[PDB]
Amino acid sequence: MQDAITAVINASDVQGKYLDTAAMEKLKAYFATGELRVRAASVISANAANIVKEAVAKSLLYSDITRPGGNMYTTRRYAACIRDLDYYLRYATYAMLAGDPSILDERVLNGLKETYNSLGVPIAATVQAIQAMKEVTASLVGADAGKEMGIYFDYICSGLS
Amino acid sequence: MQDAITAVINASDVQGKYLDTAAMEKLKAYFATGELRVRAASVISANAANIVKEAVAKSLLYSDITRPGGNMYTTRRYAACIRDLDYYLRYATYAMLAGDPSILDERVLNGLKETYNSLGVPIAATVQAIQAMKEVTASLVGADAGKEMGIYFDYICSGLS
Amino acid sequence: MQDAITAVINASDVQGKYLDTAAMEKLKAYFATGELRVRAASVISANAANIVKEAVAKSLLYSDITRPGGNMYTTRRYAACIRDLDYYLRYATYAMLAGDPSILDERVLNGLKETYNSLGVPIAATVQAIQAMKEVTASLVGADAGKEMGIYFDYICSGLS
Amino acid sequence: MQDAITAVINASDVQGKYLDTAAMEKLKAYFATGELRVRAASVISANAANIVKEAVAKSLLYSDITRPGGNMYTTRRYAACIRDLDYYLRYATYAMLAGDPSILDERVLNGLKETYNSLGVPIAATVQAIQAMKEVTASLVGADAGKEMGIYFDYICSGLS
Amino acid sequence: KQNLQLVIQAAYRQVFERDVAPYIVRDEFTALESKLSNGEITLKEFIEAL
Amino acid sequence: SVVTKSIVNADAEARYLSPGELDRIKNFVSTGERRLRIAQTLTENRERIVKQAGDQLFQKRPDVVSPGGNAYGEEMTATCLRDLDYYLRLVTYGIVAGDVTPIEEIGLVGVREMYNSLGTPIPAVAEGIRAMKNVACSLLSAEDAAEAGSYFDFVIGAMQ
Amino acid sequence: SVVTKSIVNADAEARYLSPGELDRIKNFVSTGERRLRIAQTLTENRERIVKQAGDQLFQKRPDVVSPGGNAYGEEMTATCLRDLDYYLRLVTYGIVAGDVTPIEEIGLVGVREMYNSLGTPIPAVAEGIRAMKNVACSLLSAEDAAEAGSYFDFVIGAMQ
Amino acid sequence: SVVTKSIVNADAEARYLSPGELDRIKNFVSTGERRLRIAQTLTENRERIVKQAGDQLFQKRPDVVSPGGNAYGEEMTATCLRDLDYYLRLVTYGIVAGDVTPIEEIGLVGVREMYNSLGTPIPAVAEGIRAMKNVACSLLSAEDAAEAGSYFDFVIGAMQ
Amino acid sequence: SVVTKSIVNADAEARYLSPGELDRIKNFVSTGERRLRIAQTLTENRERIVKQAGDQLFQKRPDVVSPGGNAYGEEMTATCLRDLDYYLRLVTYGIVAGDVTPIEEIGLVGVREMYNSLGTPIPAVAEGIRAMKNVACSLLSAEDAAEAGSYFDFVIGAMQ
Amino acid sequence: SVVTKSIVNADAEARYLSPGELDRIKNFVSTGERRLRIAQTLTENRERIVKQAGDQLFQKRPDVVSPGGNAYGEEMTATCLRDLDYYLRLVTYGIVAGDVTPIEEIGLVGVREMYNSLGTPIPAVAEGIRAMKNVACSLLSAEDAAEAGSYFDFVIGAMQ
Amino acid sequence: RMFKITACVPSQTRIRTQRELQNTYFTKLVPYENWFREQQRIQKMGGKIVKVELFTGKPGVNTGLA
Ligand SMILES: *[C@H](C)[C@H]1/C(=C/c2[nH]c(/C=C3N=C(/C=C4\NC(=O)C(CC)=C4C)C(C)=C\3CCC(=O)O)c(CCC(=O)O)c2C)NC(=O)[C@@H]1C
Ligand SMILES: *[C@H](C)[C@H]1/C(=C/c2[nH]c(/C=C3N=C(/C=C4\NC(=O)C(CC)=C4C)C(C)=C\3CCC(=O)O)c(CCC(=O)O)c2C)NC(=O)[C@@H]1C
Ligand SMILES: *[C@H](C)[C@H]1/C(=C/c2[nH]c(/C=C3N=C(/C=C4\NC(=O)C(CC)=C4C)C(C)=C\3CCC(=O)O)c(CCC(=O)O)c2C)NC(=O)[C@@H]1C
Ligand SMILES: *[C@H](C)[C@H]1/C(=C/c2[nH]c(/C=C3N=C(/C=C4\NC(=O)C(CC)=C4C)C(C)=C\3CCC(=O)O)c(CCC(=O)O)c2C)NC(=O)[C@@H]1C
Ligand SMILES: *[C@H](C)[C@H]1/C(=C/c2[nH]c(/C=C3N=C(/C=C4\NC(=O)C(CC)=C4C)C(C)=C\3CCC(=O)O)c(CCC(=O)O)c2C)NC(=O)[C@@H]1C
Numbered sequence A, B, C, D: 001m002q003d004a005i006t007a008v009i010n011a012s013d014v015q016g017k018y019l020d021t022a023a024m025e026k027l028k029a030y031f032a033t034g035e036l037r038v039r040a041a042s043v044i045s046a047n048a049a050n051i052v053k054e055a056v057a058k059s060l061l062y063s064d065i066t067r068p069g070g071n072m073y074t075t076r077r078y079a080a081c082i083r084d085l086d087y088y089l090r091y092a093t094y095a096m097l098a099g100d101p102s103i104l105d106e107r108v109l110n111g112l113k114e115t116y117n118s119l120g121v122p123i124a125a126t127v128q129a130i131q132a133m134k135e136v137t138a139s140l141v142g143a144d145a146g147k148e149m150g151i152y153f154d155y156i157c158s159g160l161s
Numbered sequence E: 001k002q003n004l005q006l007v008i009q010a011a012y013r014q015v016f017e018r019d020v021a022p023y024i025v026r027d028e029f030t031a032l033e034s035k036l037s038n039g040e041i042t043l044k045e046f047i048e049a050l
Numbered sequence F, G, H, I, J: 001s002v003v004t005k006s007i008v009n010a011d012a013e014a015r016y017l018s019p020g021e022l023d024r025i026k027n028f029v030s031t032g033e034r035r036l037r038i039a040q041t042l043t044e045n046r047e048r049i050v051k052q053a054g055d056q057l058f059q060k061r062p063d064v065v066s067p068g069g070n071a072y073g074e075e076m077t078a079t080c081l082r083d084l085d086y087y088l089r090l091v092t093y094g095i096v097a098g099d100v101t102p103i104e105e106i107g108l109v110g111v112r113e114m115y116n117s118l119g120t121p122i123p124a125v126a127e128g129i130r131a132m133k134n135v136a137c138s139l140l141s142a143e144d145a146a147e148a149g150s151y152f153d154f155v156i157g158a159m160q
Numbered sequence K: 001r002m003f004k005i006t007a008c009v010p011s012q013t014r015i016r017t018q019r020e021l022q023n024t025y026f027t028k029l030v031p032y033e034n035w036f037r038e039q040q041r042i043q044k045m046g047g048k049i050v051k052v053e054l055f056t057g058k059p060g061v062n063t064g065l066a
C-alpha cells in the first residue's frame, strides 16, 4: 500500500534528498484535496449497497448471463458476483482516500485475470459492471469527487482488460 | 464428485429445464443396474490386493522396468507403483458405484499426467498394466459388471494417454 | 544431496553391477582429498563473517549500488545482501566438503536467477561480489584448497549468470 | 537429557571449577565401559522384534490377559501392548548407551503410571513383561552388558510400580 | 513486509510458546522462502517446517 | 446423492465401501422408483402448484404486490413467480437425488446475499415456498408427501 | 450397528437424525429377525465350519502346518483353529449388528501388527477365513449366504 | 502515513472507513501545515543538528573514535556523520507522513544485522540519535519538540 | 554417506559443520580404504555367498522350496537367489559409503510392501540375509567381518 | 556429547541407533583418553592462556580498554578476563564431551542477548577467544592443537 | 525433492468477505513426501491442478535423493 505522502517521500528517498520545497508543494496539494476525499468516502460507504444494487440491475440483470447457463446463474454465482463488485468498490474508495493507485495494483489486480480466466468468469461483463458502478458512484459523490474516483475505476477496468 | 443421478439433474439444470421423461429414463436405467453394481464392488474390495498382484505379475514383472535403471527398480519405487495401482483400482470402483466418470476426472486424472511426466513415469507401461487389471477384474466381477468396469478403466487409460 | 561417494555408488546401482574398478578409483581419490576438505571447512567456519565483511567492502560498498536507488541502499536490503553472501559461502563450503555441486543445484540455484530478476537484484554485482569472496577465502584456506573451492564458487556464478 | 559425561561435566559446571582428577576418573570409567555398551546396543537392535516376541510369549501369552476380557485381548490392545514393549526396550537401549537413567525418567516414567491407571492397563503385568524382556536381552548381549541393561529395566519397573 | 515480519514472529510465539531470542544460538530459520517467495508461501508449510 | 456421500466418506478414510455403506446404496437403488414417481407428479402439476401458491402468497402479505413492495407491477410479480418455479424444480432434483446437496448447490448458498442485493424480503420468500408446499402436499399421497415435505422444510429453513 | 453408525455421522454433522437415516434404521429394524436367524445357524454349526474350513486351509497351504511352519505341532495348529473360531464369532456379531463396527473394533484393526509379532502370514489367515466363508455359504440359503458373505469378504480383504 | 495505516486495518477487517477513522484522516490533513513547518525547520538546520550531536556522541563514547574503533580516522568519522544525517532525514519524512511506517520501512528493519556486519556498535548509534533529539529540543518550541521527539523516540527504541 | 549426513544436519541447523561432525567425517575418510577393501572381497566372492547362503536358507525352511512356498520350483528359487544377490550388492555400497543411507533408500523403503504384493514371507527373507552374513563373515577377517556384519544386521532388522 | 546427540536423533526418528551412529560413538570412545589429556593440559595452563591472550586482545582492540569502552578500569578488565576464563573452561568441557553440546548449553544460548544487556561487544569477545585459541594451540601438540582449536573455532563462529 | 505446483481452490462452502485470492490461486513448493497427501487433499477439495514441476531433485535418481 502507498499513498500521496508515501509516494512523495519515496521519490525523495530514491533521490537521497531531504524534502524539497517542490515535494512540500505536492504534499500541500494532496492535503488540499484530502478534505473532499473524506466526505466522498463517507457518502459511498453509506450507499455502497445501493450502488452495487443499481449497477447490477443496470447491466447484469435480466440477461442470459444470469439466466441458466450464463455463469452468473446459480445463487452462489450471483453472491460471488455481487461480492466482487463490493470488493472493487471498497478498494476504489481506499485508493480514492489515499490518492494513489498502489492498493488496486497490488492487492486486487494481480492474479485476478488468471483466476477469472481459469474459472470462466466474463471479464468483459465485469468491466461493464464496474463501469456502471463508476457512473452511479459519481452521481452520488458529486462531480469533483467523481473525477477522483473514476480514474481508479478505470484503472481496475484496464487491469481486468 | 458426481454420480449418475447428480449428472442427470445437473445437465437438466444447465439447460434450466425441469426433469424430462427421457432424463427419468436414464435414472431408471441406473437404478435397474444398481444392485449389479453393488455386488461387483464387494468382490473388487475383497480381492483388491490379489487383483493388483496378478495384474502386475502379468504386465510389469520380470521386465526391463523392474530390472536396474528401469524406473521401478529400487524397493521405494516398486512400493509406489503398486500403491498407485491400488489407488487406481479403488477410484475405479468408486466411479463404478457412482455410475459416472466425474470422480475419475476430479480426483484422479487431474494433475496425474503433469506429475507423471514431471517424474518421467512410463505412461505407456502404466496404461498396459491397468488394462491387465481390467481383464482380471472382468473375470472376477463377471461379464455384465466387467463391461461397466471396462469403460472406467479405459477412461483412466485415456487420461494417462 | 549427493556426496562424491553417493554419486559414484548411484551410478553403479543404476547399472546394477557391483562397484567397478574405475568406481573404486574414484572413491579412493575422494578419500585422498577428504582430510584437506575438512581442514578448509574448519578455517572458513571460523572466519565466515570476516570473509563476508571483506568481500562486501571490496566491491559492494561506497558504490552506486549501496548509494540511494541502487538496490543495496535501505537497511533491510543491505541486511538481505549480506545474508545472501553468507548463504553463498555456507553452501559453497557444503559443496566443497561434499566434493560435488549437487547441493548447490538443488538448494541454491533453483529459482534463484528468476527471483533475483523479479526483485531487480543486480546479478552482475552479485557475481563480482562472490568472486571477491572467492579471492578472500582462497587466501585464508590456502591455494590448493582454494583452487578446489573456486570450482563451486564459479558454479554459483554460472547459475546466477 | 543427560548421559554419564554430561552429568559429570554439569556437576563440575555448577561449581564452576575445571574438571578435577576425580571427575576425569569418572569420565575414564565411562570410556572404559563404552565399547561393550556399543556392542550390546548393536546386538539388541538386530533382535528387537524377537526379544519382544519371546517376552510376550514367556509371560503375556496363553494367560487370562490375552484371553477374552483380559486387556491384551482385542487385536488393537495386543498391538498397543507390543508397542509399549517396543518403547520400553528402545528406551532401555537409549539409557544403556547413555550410561544415565535420565532418559527413562524424562521420556518414559513421567505420567506413565497415571495413564496406565486411566487406561486400565495392569501395571503389575507390564512390570512382569519387561522383566521377561530383561532376561532375553541379557542373554543376547552377554552377562556384563546384561547387568547394565538390567539396571535400566529395573528402573522402568520401579517407575511403573 | 511489515506484516510479514509480524506474522513470522507470531508463528514463533505460537509454535515455540515464546520469542526465541533466548534459547537459540543464532536465528536458525530462513523466512526468505515464506517472504516474497513461493517456497514456503504456505504458512501451512512454514509452521510445519518450524 | 447418498451414493456420492458414501464414496466421499470412504475416500476420506482411504477404504473401499464397507458392507453397510454398500447396503445403503442398495436400499436407495430400490427406493428410486418411488422417488421418481413423486418427482414425476410434481413436474406434471408444476403450473398448478406455482399459480395458486403465488396468489396465496400475495394474499398473505400484500405489501409485496402493493406499491413500494419489491414485486410491485406485473413484470416484477412475473419474475418472482418464476423464482417460485425455480425452487420447486430444485426440490424435484432433491427428491430424485435423495439428499439436499443439489438443492443447496443450485439455490441456497448465499440466499440472503442474493435476495437482499435484489431488495427482496426473505421472510416473504419463506411464505411463498410454504404455499408451494401446501399445494404440493394436496397433489401428493399422504405417505409420499412426507418425503417431499422434508425437502420443502429444509428449503424454508435455509430461506431464513 | 446401523444405529451407531448413523448417530456417529449425524453427531459430526451436528444434526438431528436425517429422515433418510431414520428410514434406513427402520428397514434394519424390520430385517433384524432374518439377521438373527442367519447368526443362529452359524453358531449352531460353529464346530463343522471351523474343522472343515481349517482342513481346507491346510490343504491349500501345506507350508503353515509343515515343520518350519507357524502351526506345526498339534497345539499350535489348535490355537490357529481357535483364531478361526474367534473370527467366525466376530462375523456373527457383525451380521447381527448390521455394520463392521463390532468386527473391526474387536479384531481386524491392529491385525498386521499382532500377526507380525506372532509370526503368522496374514494372507494365510485370510485363506482360512475364506474357507470358513465357503462352508458358511453351503450352510446358508443363497440370500442368507450373500448377507453373511459380505462380512466374511470385509474380513479377508482387511487381512490381505 | 495515518491515512494508509487506517486503510490497511479497514482492508483487513473488510470495512469501509469508520466515521471516526474518517475524522482522524481529516484532522491529519488539516494539521499538515504544522507538520510541514516542523519538517522545514529540521531540514533548515540539518548541518548543525548532525554536527553538534555527533560531536556530543563522540565525547560521550570516546571508544568509537579511538584507535582500533569503528570510527577511527576522518574518513570513517565522515561516514558516521553520514549515518546520522540519514536518520535525521528519515525523521523529517516521518513527521511529514504523520506515521513511523516510512521510518521503519527505510531504516529500522534490520539495523542490528547491518551494523553488526559493519562492526558498528548499535547502542552507540542509539546514543548518537539521542544526542540529535537533545539538540532538537532547543531548535523546536516545547509544543513542537514533543511532536518531533516521538519519532526520535521510536528510532532510538528500535536501535537499542 | 557420513559426509552428506553431516552436511544435511548442518544445513538444517543453519551452521557450518561442528568440530564433532568434522571429526566424524575425518574418521570415515581414514577408514574408507578398508571399507573399499571389504567391498572388494565381497564382490569377489559374490556368487559363493549367495549360492551357499541361499541353500542354507532352503535347508532351514523346507516350506520355502516346497509347494505353497514362494520359491517353489527351480526358476522361482533362482529369482530368490537374485534378490539375495541384490542385497549383497547394497551391503557393499553401504560399507563403502560408511552409512546405511544407500541401503535404506535403494532396498529398504517399503521392503515389506513390495514383498506383501509379491506374497513373499519377510522373516524367511531375513533368515536368508542372516546366512549371507555368516558366509561373508567367514570370508572376511575378524575386524572386517564386524564392519560388514553391522550393515547386514540393519538389513535383517528392517526385514523383521 | 556424541552419545546423547546420537540418542536424541534416534529418538526423534523413533528408531534404534543405526550402525553408523553406533560406530561413531565407538570411535569417539576409543579416542577418549586423548581427549581427556587435551583437557588436562588446557586446565593446567588455564592461567597463562587467559592472561597473555587477554593482553593480545587488548592490543587487537584498543577501543575496549579506552575510556568509554566496556572494559575500562581495572575492575571491568578483571571481569572480562573472568569471562575468558569461563569460556576456556567450557572449551575443556566440550573437548571432554566430544561435542559442542555442553559449550552451547552453558555459554552460547542467548550469548548475543546477554552481552547486549551488558553493553559488551560480541565481536570483541570473539577476538579474545581467538587469542586464547592461539595460545592453547601453541601449548598443545600439532595433532592435539587441531582438535582443541576446532572447538575454539566453533565458539568464535557462534560469537560472530 | 520439492515439487513446484500451481493450483486453484474454488470453494462453494461459503462466500468470503475477507480476501480469498491468496488461497484461491497459488504456487507452492511441496516436498516429495508431502505431495501425495497434498495432491489428494486438493483433488478432494476439487481445485484444478494447473501445473507441476520438479523444482528440486532430478527426474530419476536411484539413490542420493534430497
Ligand atoms: C419470490 C417469491 C419473491 C420475490 C423475488 C424477486 N426476485 C427477483 C429477481 C431475481 N431472482 C433471481 C433468483 C435466482 N437466480 C438463481 O440462479 C436462482 C437459483 C436457480 C434463483 C432463485 C435472480 C437471478 C433475479 C434477477 C433477475 C434475473 O433473473 O435476471 C425479482 C425482481 C427484482 C427486480 O426489481 O429487478 C423479484 C421481485 N419478490 C417477491 O415479492 C417475493 C417475496
Ligand atoms: C460479477 C461482476 C461477475 C462474476 C463473478 C464471479 N467471481 C467468482 C469468484 C471469484 N472472484 C474472485 C475475485 C476476488 N477475490 C478477491 O479477494 C478480490 C478482492 C481483492 C477479488 C476481486 C475470486 C478469488 C474468486 C474465486 C474464489 C471465490 O469463490 O471467491 C465467481 C465464482 C466462480 C465459481 O463458480 O467458483 C463468480 C460467478 N460472475 C459474473 O457473471 C460477473 C460478470
Ligand atoms: C506403476 C504402474 C508405474 C510407476 C509409478 C510410480 N509413481 C510414482 C510417484 C507418484 N505417483 C503419483 C500419483 C498419484 N498420487 C496420487 O495421490 C494418486 C491417486 C489420485 C495418484 C495416481 C504421485 C503424486 C507420485 C509422487 C509422490 C509419490 O511417490 O507418491 C513413483 C515414484 C517415483 C520416485 O520415487 O522418484 C513411481 C515409481 N513406476 C513404474 O515403473 C510403473 C510403470
Ligand atoms: C555513527 C553514529 C556510528 C558509526 C557508523 C558507521 N557506519 C558505517 C557504514 C555504513 N552505514 C550505513 C548505513 C545506512 N545504510 C542505509 O541504507 C541506511 C538507512 C537509509 C543507513 C543508516 C551503510 C550502508 C554503511 C556502509 C558503507 C556505505 O555506506 O557504503 C561506517 C563505516 C564502516 C567501514 O569501515 O566502512 C561507520 C563507522 N560508527 C560510529 O562510530 C558511530 C557510533
Ligand atoms: C547481495 C549480494 C545483493 C542483493 C541481494 C538481495 N536479495 C534479496 C532477496 C532475496 N534473496 C534471496 C536469496 C536466497 N534465498 C535463499 O533461501 C537462499 C539459500 C540458497 C538464497 C541465496 C531470495 C530468495 C530473495 C527473495 C525473497 C525475499 O524478498 O527475501 C533482496 C531483497 C529485495 C527487496 O526488495 O526486499 C536483496 C536486496 N542486493 C544487492 O544490491 C546485492 C548486489
Ligand SMILES: *[C@H](C)[C@H]1/C(=C/c2[nH]c(/C=C3N=C(/C=C4\NC(=O)C(CC)=C4C)C(C)=C\3CCC(=O)O)c(CCC(=O)O)c2C)NC(=O)[C@@H]1C
Residues within 6 Å of the ligand: D057, D060, D061, D062, D063, D066, D067, D072, D073, D074, D075, D078, G064, G065, G070, G071, G076, G077, G079, G080, G081, G083, G084, G086, G087, G106, G107, G108, G118, G120, G121, G124, G125, G128
Ligand atoms: C490361523 C488360521 C493361522 C495361524 C495363527 C496362529 N495364531 C497364533 C497365536 C495367537 N493368535 C492370536 C489372535 C487373536 N487375538 C485376538 O484378540 C483376536 C481377535 C479377537 C485374535 C484373532 C493371539 C492373541 C495369539 C497368541 C497366543 C494366545 O492367544 O495367547 C499362533 C501361535 C503362535 C505361536 O507359535 O506361539 C498361530 C500358529 N497359524 C497358522 O498357520 C494359520 C495360517
Ligand SMILES: *[C@H](C)[C@H]1/C(=C/c2[nH]c(/C=C3N=C(/C=C4\NC(=O)C(CC)=C4C)C(C)=C\3CCC(=O)O)c(CCC(=O)O)c2C)NC(=O)[C@@H]1C
Residues within 6 Å of the ligand: D065, D070, D071, D072, D077, D078, D080, D081, D082, D084, D085, D087, D088, D107, D108, D112, D115, D119, D121, D122, D125, D126, D129
Ligand atoms: C503390555 C506390556 C501391557 C498392555 C499395554 C497397553 N497399553 C495401552 C496404551 C498405551 N500405552 C501408552 C504408553 C506409552 N506411550 C508412550 O509414548 C511410551 C514411551 C514414551 C509409553 C510407555 C500410552 C500412551 C497408551 C495410550 C495410547 C495408545 O493407545 O497408545 C493399551 C491400550 C489401552 C486401550 O484400550 O486404549 C494397552 C492394552 N496391555 C497389557 O495387557 C500388558 C500388561
Ligand SMILES: *[C@H](C)[C@H]1/C(=C/c2[nH]c(/C=C3N=C(/C=C4\NC(=O)C(CC)=C4C)C(C)=C\3CCC(=O)O)c(CCC(=O)O)c2C)NC(=O)[C@@H]1C
Residues within 6 Å of the ligand: B061, B062, B063, B066, B067, B072, B073, B074, B075, B078, I064, I065, I069, I070, I071, I072, I076, I077, I079, I080, I081, I083, I084, I086, I106, I107, I118, I120, I121, I124, I125, I128
Ligand atoms: C528370497 C530370499 C525370498 C524370495 C523372493 C522372491 N522374489 C521374487 C520376485 C521379485 N523380487 C523382486 C525384488 C527386488 N526388486 C528390487 O528392485 C530390489 C532391491 C534392489 C529387490 C529386493 C522383484 C522386483 C521381483 C519380481 C519381478 C522381478 O524379478 O524383477 C519371487 C518370484 C515371485 C513368485 O513366486 O512368482 C520370489 C520367490 N522367495 C523366497 O522363498 C525367499 C524367502
